[PDB]
């Protein structure tokens, strides 16, 4: 049921990122038909900063996740269009994150376009509303000014803070980038909730 | 230390190479100037390789 | 009480040292009860002993 959950939840992922939808929305059946035929589905979203975010939903048995050359060609072609392309999101199956060759083309493309953010994510990252999960506390990105004043009061450097990966599901849904700060309201059984600020580091892959 | 001009061109270039800042340029084909560094020395060839 | 017990007083904004000294010696009751002279003489008796 991975594809159904992906279809219903990727759009709320886009909305939670405060991104306006582009193109249109297609039914489930047409969605899986495109996924099986073309090998992937592409969703285009626009950020508040007038940038463009493209979400690529690849198939588990698709050719684009079995041959590295096809993925290289797709990334080169998509990055060759005329759009701001703030972030590229590629949603793949879990074993695809283990096939080292695909990760190698991902790294090569990331090096090719430094200003362009390319991240590859598993299916389970978008198969549930992550911010609504009970076990996940409320994560919120704090601006650099608030983080700087907090660090100045505490006589701390950003590297002294507790770390959080940019591939952390709450951070992914927030859109946090490495070097940013996330304020987390965690429930507490000693103080009846607490506030912690974590430093966003390099995403796994 | 402190090389001296008394000797012909030897043991005054050798003592010069004792200083890390003084690096030589080597051709490996010319026989006019041949010195043996007292210690291990980093050199550059006439083309540029270190 | 300073002349009779090691509670040499100082005053700060929150008088936190004042309360801490009223805790070690006992006599925290002066904050809400008039007493004062009740265990002042008890302090005299203790110092004499």
């Amino acid at each position: 049921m991975a594809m159904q959950k992906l279809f219903t939840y990727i759009y709320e992922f886009i909305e939670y990122r405060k991104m306006v939808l582009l193109e249109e929305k297609v039914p489930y059946d047409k969605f899986v038909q495109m996924v099986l035929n073309t090998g992937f589905f592409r969703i285009n979203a626009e950020t508040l900063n007038h940038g463009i975010v493209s979400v690529f939903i690849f198939g588990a048995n698709g050719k684009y996740v079995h041959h590295g050359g096809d993925m290289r060609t797709l990334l080169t072609n998509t990055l060759n269009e005329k759009k701001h392309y703030e972030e590229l999101i590629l949603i793949v199956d879990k074993p695809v994150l283990s096939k080292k060759n695909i990760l190698d083309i991902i790294v090569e493309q990331r090096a090719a376009n430094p200003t362009i953010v390319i991240n590859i994510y598993p299916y389970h990252l978008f198969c549930i509303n992550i911010p609504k999960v009970s076990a996940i506390p409320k994560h919120k990105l704090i601006t650099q000014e608030e983080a700087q004043e907090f660090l100045g009061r505490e006589y701390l450097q950003p590297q002294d803070l507790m770390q959080i990966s940019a591939s952390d599901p709450p951070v992914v849904w927030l859109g946090g980038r490495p070097g940013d700060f996330v304020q987390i309201e965690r429930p507490s059984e000693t103080a009846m909730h607490a506030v912690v600020i974590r430093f966003i580091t390099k995403s796994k892959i | 230390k402190l090389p001296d001009l008394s000797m012909p061109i030897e043991a005054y270039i050798r003592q010069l190479l004792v200083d890390p800042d003084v690096v030589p340029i080597v051709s490996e084909k010319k026989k006019e100037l041949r010195v043996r560094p007292s210690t291990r020395k980093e050199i550059f060839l006439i083309n540029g390789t270190h | 009480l300073s002349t009779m017990y090691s509670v040499s007083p100082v005053f700060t904004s929150g008088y936190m040292p004042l309360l801490y000294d009223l805790y070690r010696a006992g006599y925290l009751e002066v904050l809400w009860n008039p007493v004062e002279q009740k265990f002042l003489q008890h302090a005299e008796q203790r110092e004499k002993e």
Binding site: S134 | - | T12, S13, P34
Partner: protein, 76 residues
């Protein structure tokens, strides 16, 4: 908070009791027992003043984590 805690646990039930540094009710009971009075007459000014003191004390409570100096300065 403690119903959310129930949700990501197997058998961690919401409880009415908490571990706190100060047992306020015990302090109030001790002061009332040591009080040389009882059933004070109605006083609007006194009641409102006590409410204001409690509200200010709650507002200045996190200053026990810093010092009396910052509490006096009312720094953020």
């Amino acid at each position: 908070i403690f119903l959310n805690v129930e949700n990501f646990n197997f058998s961690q039930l919401l409880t009415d009791v908490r571990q706190v540094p100060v047992n306020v009710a015990s302090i109030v009971k001790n002061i009332l027992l040591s009080s040389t009075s009882g059933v004070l007459p109605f006083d609007e000014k006194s009641i409102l003043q006590k409410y204001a003191m409690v509200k200010t004390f709650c507002k200045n409570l996190p200053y026990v984590f810093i010092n009396n100096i910052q509490e006096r300065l009312q720094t953020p």
